[PDB]
A paper describes a structure:
Among the numerous protein families facilitating PPIs, the family of 14-3-3 proteins stands out due to their ubiquity and high conservation across isoforms. These ‘central hub’ proteins hold a key role in cellular signaling networks, as they are known to interact with over 1200 protein clients, and are involved in pathways related to metabolism, apoptosis, cell signaling and tumor development. Protein interaction with 14-3-3 can yield a multitude of effects,8e.g., the structural stabilization of the client protein, the masking of functional sequences, or bringing two proteins together. In this work, we developed and validated a deep learning approach for predicting putative protein–protein interaction sites between 14-3-3 proteins and phosphorylated client proteins.
Our approach was applied prospectively to identify putative binding sites across medically relevant proteins (ranging from highly structured to intrinsically disordered) for a total of approximately 300 sequences. The top eight predicted peptide sequences were experimentally validated in the wet-lab, and binding to 14-3-3 was confirmed for five out of eight sequences (Kd ranging from 1.6 ± 0.1 μM to 70 ± 5 μM). The relevance of our results was further confirmed by X-ray crystallography and molecular dynamics simulations. These sequences represent potential new binding sites within the 14-3-3 interactome (e.g., relating to Alzheimer's disease as the binding to tau is not the new part), and provide opportunities to investigate their functional relevance. Structural characterization via X-ray crystallography further substantiated our findings, revealing binding modes consistent with known 14-3-3-client interactions. This includes an ‘open’ binding mode, where peptides bend out of the 14-3-3 pocket, an ‘extended’ binding mode, in which peptides occupy the entire 14-3-3 pocket, and peptides featuring a disordered C-terminus. The identification of such structurally representative 14-3-3 binding motifs, without having provided such structural information to our models, testifies to the strength of our deep learning approach.
Numbering used by the authors:
A (entry chain P), B (entry chain P): 193 to 200
C (entry chain A), D (entry chain A): -4 to 231
The structure:
Amino acid sequence: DRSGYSSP
Amino acid sequence: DRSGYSSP
Amino acid sequence: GAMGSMERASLIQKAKLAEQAERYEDMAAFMKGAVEKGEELSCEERNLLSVAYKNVVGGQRAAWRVLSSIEQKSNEEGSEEKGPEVREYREKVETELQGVCDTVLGLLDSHLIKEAGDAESRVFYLKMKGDYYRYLAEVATGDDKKRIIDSARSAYQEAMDISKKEMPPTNPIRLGLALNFSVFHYEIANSPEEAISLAKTTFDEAMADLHTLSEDSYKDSTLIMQLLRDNLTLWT
Amino acid sequence: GAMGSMERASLIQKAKLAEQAERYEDMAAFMKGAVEKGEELSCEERNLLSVAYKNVVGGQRAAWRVLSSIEQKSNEEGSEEKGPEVREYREKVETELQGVCDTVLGLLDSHLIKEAGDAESRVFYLKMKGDYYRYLAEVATGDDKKRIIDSARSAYQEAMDISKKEMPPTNPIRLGLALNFSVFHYEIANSPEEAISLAKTTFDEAMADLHTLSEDSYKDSTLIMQLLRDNLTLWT
Ligand SMILES: [Ca+2]
Ligand SMILES: [Ca+2]
Ligand SMILES: [Ca+2]
Ligand SMILES: [Ca+2]
Ligand SMILES: [Ca+2]
Ligand SMILES: [Ca+2]
Ligand SMILES: [Ca+2]
Ligand SMILES: [Ca+2]
Ligand SMILES: [Ca+2]
Ligand SMILES: [Ca+2]
Ligand SMILES: [Ca+2]
Ligand SMILES: [Ca+2]
Ligand SMILES: [Ca+2]
Ligand SMILES: [Ca+2]
Ligand SMILES: [Cl-]
Ligand SMILES: [Cl-]
């Protein structure tokens, strides 16, 4: 669930 | 010269 | 402010040095000092601000997650009572994280957003506002939580509305905004379908516009598109 | 002390949590608080103290090296003048590093070393004294430098004398002391031949004693022996 990638 | 390993 | 006596240009120079040295707390303090000079930030300077605080809060978030997981396990049946220390130390880290988020939000409110008229700057700052409310939401418990979640949502939505009107679908700021708003939907707002729809639509509209781009712009846009794809693969 | 109101056992518990969270500045502050309770430290607690400060000073040393290299390049012929900022920021990092070293040395002097009677504890602390003077020496300029170098040397030599009399040649503390004193010789004291001799003699005497060890002790000793070998390979 929390493993989603946000902008680097 | 400075690349020598010290204790971890 | 401890940076009030230092020249703006010297603060920016030292922020860059701090980045090279991986001294991100220093980098953030230099950039806060630069913002507090009162002048608008250039594109490069906005990126320095973002990188600095992202790295500081990222370390805090990672630490919080470690501590929260230990605390949750302590509260399972059959777990031996160990006293207040895990909760206390989780709370310490949490309070420091909230403080960094409040500092960033404060810079945005006084007065970065109100002075930002160009789409690139306004979208950048509104995305940051959404992001730092999102980090507050990750640690919030209650309906306190509800108002924080709504603040994140509102900031992201205003940024999205501007970006769709004013920027091409391949613009990296627009793409990173959509990526982060999709994560908000999935992780915070309990809206996985909205998250998936947004990531898909964003990817597809960017793919259709890549033909307009130079080699270097193509590389910048496709990097972020890959992150959208990675999330879609995790989520579907 | 900010930790004066917290129980000793709670400080130790929180140091362990901070290690798991990779919060090494917090870990160090907890361990400083524990030392200042005035009781001697157990083996485990000595290791927590060491790990905490090693990680803090290690980040500072790495940052200092980055900044020093930029400063040296600025002073080459043909380099454009960029003002005082690189020197100032190197000096800031340097002063913070020196402060951490002075804090550790102060704990050792008040009163860890004087209360340490067993060989394992006394050697441990004297090695730490040598190490933190070595880190001071890395950034020192002058004959100020000479007295710092001599302080490191003296601490290491007292530790070596005890370790040779009281500990087997495979003991991990003894091995890590010899490793670090050899690095002192090579990097600080301009004595590469002494460094190589020490590393060789230490490796060979440990190899001859491995037959006495359990499987788990063998693993602990051979790990450090490999570092001696790695240095010999770099240096010869
Ligand atoms: Ca995530
Ligand atoms: Ca070295
Ligand atoms: Ca000025
Ligand atoms: Ca203005
Ligand atoms: Ca039990
Ligand atoms: Ca307890
Ligand atoms: Ca709280
Ligand atoms: Ca403006
Ligand atoms: Ca007590
Ligand atoms: Ca005593
Ligand atoms: Ca020139
Ligand atoms: Ca300058
Ligand atoms: Ca200095
Ligand atoms: Ca004693
Ligand atoms: Cl705490
Ligand atoms: Cl500075």
